[PDB]
Design a protein around this ligand. Structure first.
Ligand SMILES: Nc1ncnc2c1ncn2[C@@H]1O[C@H](COP(=O)(O)OP(=O)(O)O)[C@@H](O)[C@H]1O
Ligand SMILES: [Zn+2]
Length: 267
């Protein structure tokens, strides 16, 4: 792939509908713990262990403890120069009648915090709940999400499980339900929301420029959004610290932290 910023800029100057696919590398730059790698653990598990239907079915209290800790740490995390360059790009181009949409795998909402309005969160959000009984989804920013989780979630190895009884975990407040809430986060092995995927497909079909930023490009189906785009001949530019298996399928590859490359690319 090419590494010509000048050539990318020539495409960027002309594009009227830009799709920006963002992955955990954008969150990593804000110091947000991903628990994916390389040895990133919460006390004795990683995200592969706890972000699963299995985990929630065996030990919903431990899963909530994990997500509680992640909700709490967000209070000390802020968007980085990558988030901000993306948000400013959307607002600036919007004035010119040009569309910028962010499709993010990230659940930390930092794109929103930076000001992005046109955002598809394909894996959910740490700050939404879903009721396991009625299915209602709701925004929830409360610290702590429930009284039993106050002071819990500590990440140090050896920390005892809170072992909160399921009736003291977050419960649905819909009249007559009272069911157990889960984080509204897509877990490994679960299907993504068809309506969101319908929106994703509409943007991919109409864009004339596509950026893939901070993404390892092995998690499906998100690792197959950009190939469909390049097939129509639209340029795909990758911003990542390392080549991925999907690198040689892109028009541009700009190595380095996306907070360093994006402000120049989107200026
Ligand atoms: N600071 C960064 N700037 C751009 N890309 C990054 C940065 N840090 C990590 N990356 C890349 O982000 C990707 C992380 O992938 P992963 O942890 O699987 O999350 P995702 O499933 O969202 O891709 C890897 O390609 C990693 O090299
Ligand atoms: Zn309910």
């Amino acid at each position: 792939p090419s590494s010509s910023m000048a050539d990318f800029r020539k495409f960027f100057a002309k594009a009227k509908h830009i799709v920006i696919i963002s992955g955990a590398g954008v969150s990593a730059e804000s110091g947000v713990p991903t628990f994916r790698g390389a040895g990133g653990y919460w006390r004795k598990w990683q995200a592969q262990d706890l972000a699963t239907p299995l985990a929630f079915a065996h030990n919903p209290s431990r899963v909530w403890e994990f997500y509680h800790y992640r909700r709490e740490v967000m209070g000390s995390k802020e968007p980085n120069a990558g988030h901000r360059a993306i948000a400013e790009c959307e607002t600036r181009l919007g004035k010119q009648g040009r569309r910028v949409v962010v499709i993010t795998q990230n659940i930390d909402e930092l794109h929103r915090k930076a000001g992005t309005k046109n955002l598809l969160e394909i894996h959910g959000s740490l700050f939404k709940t879903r009721c396991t009984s009625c299915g209602v989804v709701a925004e929830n920013y409360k610290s702590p999400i429930c009284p039993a989780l106050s002071g819990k979630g500590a990440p140090e190895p050896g920390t005892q499980d809170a072992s909160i009884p399921v009736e003291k975990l977050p419960r649905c407040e819909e009249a007559g339900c009272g069911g157990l809430l889960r984080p509204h986060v897509v877990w490994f092995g679960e299907n993504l929301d068809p309506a969101i995927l319908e929106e994703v497909d509409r943007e991919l079909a109409h864009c004339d420029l596509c950026l893939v930023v901070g993404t390892s490009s092995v998690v499906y189906p998100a690792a197959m959004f950009a190939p469909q785009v390049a097939a129509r001949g639209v340029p795909v530019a990758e911003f990542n610290t390392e080549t991925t298996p999907a690198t040689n399928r892109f028009r541009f590859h700009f190595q380095g932290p996306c907070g360093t490359t994006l402000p120049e690319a989107l200026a």
